[PDB]
Design an enzyme around this catalytic site. Structure first.
Site, PDB file in Angstrom:
ATOM      1  N   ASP A  45       0.793  -1.044   0.194  1.00 41.17           N
ATOM      2  CA  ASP A  45       0.298  -0.247  -0.248  1.00 41.17           C
ATOM      3  C   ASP A  45       0.645   1.430  -0.130  1.00 41.17           C
ATOM      4  O   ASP A  45       2.175   1.250   0.041  1.00 41.17           O
ATOM      5  CB  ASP A  45      -0.526  -0.170   1.200  1.00 41.17           C
ATOM      6  CG  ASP A  45      -1.694  -0.137   1.505  1.00 41.17           C
ATOM      7  OD1 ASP A  45      -1.981  -1.272   1.495  1.00 41.17           O
ATOM      8  OD2 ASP A  45      -2.929  -0.176   2.136  1.00 41.17           O
ATOM      9  N   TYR A  81       2.631   4.116   1.830  1.00 44.53           N
ATOM     10  CA  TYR A  81       2.566   5.151   2.693  1.00 44.53           C
ATOM     11  C   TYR A  81       0.940   6.536   2.968  1.00 44.53           C
ATOM     12  O   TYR A  81       0.373   6.757   1.933  1.00 44.53           O
ATOM     13  CB  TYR A  81       3.021   6.149   2.832  1.00 44.53           C
ATOM     14  CG  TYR A  81       4.916   5.120   2.919  1.00 44.53           C
ATOM     15  CD1 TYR A  81       4.945   4.650   3.498  1.00 44.53           C
ATOM     16  CD2 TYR A  81       6.060   5.861   1.689  1.00 44.53           C
ATOM     17  CE1 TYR A  81       6.864   4.460   3.448  1.00 44.53           C
ATOM     18  CE2 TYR A  81       7.110   4.438   0.636  1.00 44.53           C
ATOM     19  CZ  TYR A  81       7.212   4.233   2.507  1.00 44.53           C
ATOM     20  OH  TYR A  81       8.781   3.394   2.762  1.00 44.53           O
ATOM     21  N   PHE A  89       7.802   2.141  -2.037  1.00 45.81           N
ATOM     22  CA  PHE A  89       9.173   2.626  -1.129  1.00 45.81           C
ATOM     23  C   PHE A  89       9.513   4.068  -0.501  1.00 45.81           C
ATOM     24  O   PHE A  89      10.229   4.846   0.382  1.00 45.81           O
ATOM     25  CB  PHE A  89       9.445   1.306  -1.393  1.00 45.81           C
ATOM     26  CG  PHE A  89       9.517   0.023  -1.023  1.00 45.81           C
ATOM     27  CD1 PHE A  89       9.396  -0.331   0.330  1.00 45.81           C
ATOM     28  CD2 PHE A  89       9.387  -1.061  -2.225  1.00 45.81           C
ATOM     29  CE1 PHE A  89       8.907  -1.778   0.218  1.00 45.81           C
ATOM     30  CE2 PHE A  89       9.333  -1.903  -1.496  1.00 45.81           C
ATOM     31  CZ  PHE A  89       9.097  -2.742  -0.634  1.00 45.81           C
ATOM     32  N   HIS A  96      10.899  -9.561   3.867  1.00 48.29           N
ATOM     33  CA  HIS A  96      10.963  -7.248   3.512  1.00 48.29           C
ATOM     34  C   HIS A  96      11.770  -7.124   4.401  1.00 48.29           C
ATOM     35  O   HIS A  96      12.404  -8.245   5.155  1.00 48.29           O
ATOM     36  CB  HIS A  96       8.957  -8.097   4.727  1.00 48.29           C
ATOM     37  CG  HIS A  96       8.886  -6.361   4.015  1.00 48.29           C
ATOM     38  ND1 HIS A  96       9.067  -5.499   4.034  1.00 48.29           N
ATOM     39  CD2 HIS A  96       8.109  -6.319   2.920  1.00 48.29           C
ATOM     40  CE1 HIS A  96       8.968  -4.592   3.644  1.00 48.29           C
ATOM     41  NE2 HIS A  96       7.643  -4.593   2.543  1.00 48.29           N
TER      42      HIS A  96
END
Lengths: 216, 110
Positions: A59, A61, A72, A180
């Protein structure tokens, strides 16, 4: 082959009218990120013909002045998210260079498609726009990249991104995958995984020039 | 008072951090097996479950080298705590979808 042609294919095969109606109302009555005009920025900055590496995010931020339509990346003056901090630490250990800007528009210009699987979020509410149609869209985008490009690196961080393996032809394409980069998981295999040089080694093996991952 | 804000009051008092420093939050989904200590990841309980993860951050948090976090499995709260300066997870709350395993949520009463 152009994004506009691909989008036309996708919007013909699936009916997104209810998604657009839901978003129209969300942007009127609530605080939705990123800014509307930035929703497709990953596509605007990495034309289809230019893609060399695909990095999947989740998703956008969900805080003020963070998201701007790239996985990112945050806006140039925003603070470092924990995952990006870790990505840059691995970058310094792998490639050698040090980035201090948290903005990834340079990577996108180099041919890195920074594709979130869901492209909008309500402020402070993680996953608030899950299942409104973005996954359908973005699954179709991954497929299209796989189908129409000759040789791309897909970088798949975390289990959710790794669920897209079935959409990627691995006889054509390179998959690089790991846990991750979040500080919650990063020590279980993100650090030391060298995704950046691995991506570049594959690109060179296939006669393409490397990504410049340093500030550019 | 929200859980995030209870967590913030607890951490800022414990680590003597500025109270009006903004905490930002990153939300990431990841499998429980890659997030939690092995002893707390077991078949039929948390193993193979995707958690929704909230990790809070700010400049003085980075200076103290900690990461306050809250973990959910769908609507069920799974963990509250912080990753400390040794990169160990320090729990105020831990539930494995079967029973509560650790519960010092009284520490969040403010």
């Amino acid at each position: 082959m152009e994004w506009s042609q691909i989008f036309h294919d996708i919007t013909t095969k699936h009916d997104f009218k209810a998604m657009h109606d839901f978003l129209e109302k969300e942007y009127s009555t609530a605080i939705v990120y990123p800014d509307r005009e930035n929703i497709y920025q990953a596509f605007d900055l990495t034309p289809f013909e230019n893609i060399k590496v695909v990095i999947l995010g989740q998703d956008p931020y969900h805080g003020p002045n963070q998201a701007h339509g790239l996985a990112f990346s945050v806006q140039p003056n925003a603070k470092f998210p924990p995952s990006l901090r870790n990505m840059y630490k691995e970058l310094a250990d792998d490639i050698g260079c040090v980035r201090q800007t948290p903005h990834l528009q340079d990577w996108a210009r180099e041919g890195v498609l920074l594709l979130n699987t869901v492209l909008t979020v309500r402020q402070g509410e993680a996953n608030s726009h899950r299942d409104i149609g973005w996954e359908t869209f973005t699954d179709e985008i991954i497929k299209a990249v796989s189908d129409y490009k000759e040789h791309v690196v897909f970088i798949l961080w975390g289990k959710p991104a790794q669920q897209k393996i079935k959409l990627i032809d691995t006889s054509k394409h390179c998959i690089i995958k790991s846990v991750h980069p979040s500080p919650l998981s990063a020590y279980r295999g993100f650090f030391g995984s060298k995704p950046y040089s691995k991506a570049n080694t594959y690109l060179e093996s296939v006669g393409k020039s490397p990504i410049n991952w340093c500030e550019s | 008072m929200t859980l995030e804000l209870q967590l913030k009051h607890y951490i800022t008092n414990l680590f003597n951090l500025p109270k009006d420093e903004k905490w930002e939050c990153e939300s990431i989904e990841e499998i429980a097996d890659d997030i939690l200590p092995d002893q707390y990841v077991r078949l039929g309980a948390l193993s193979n479950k995707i958690l929704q993860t909230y990790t809070y951050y700010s400049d003085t948090l980075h200076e103290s080298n900690i990461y306050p976090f809250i973990l959910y499995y769908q609507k069920q709260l799974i963990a509250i705590g912080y990753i400390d300066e040794n990169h160990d997870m320090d729990f105020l709350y831990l539930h494995n979808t079967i029973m509560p395993l650790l519960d010092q949520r009284y520490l969040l009463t403010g």
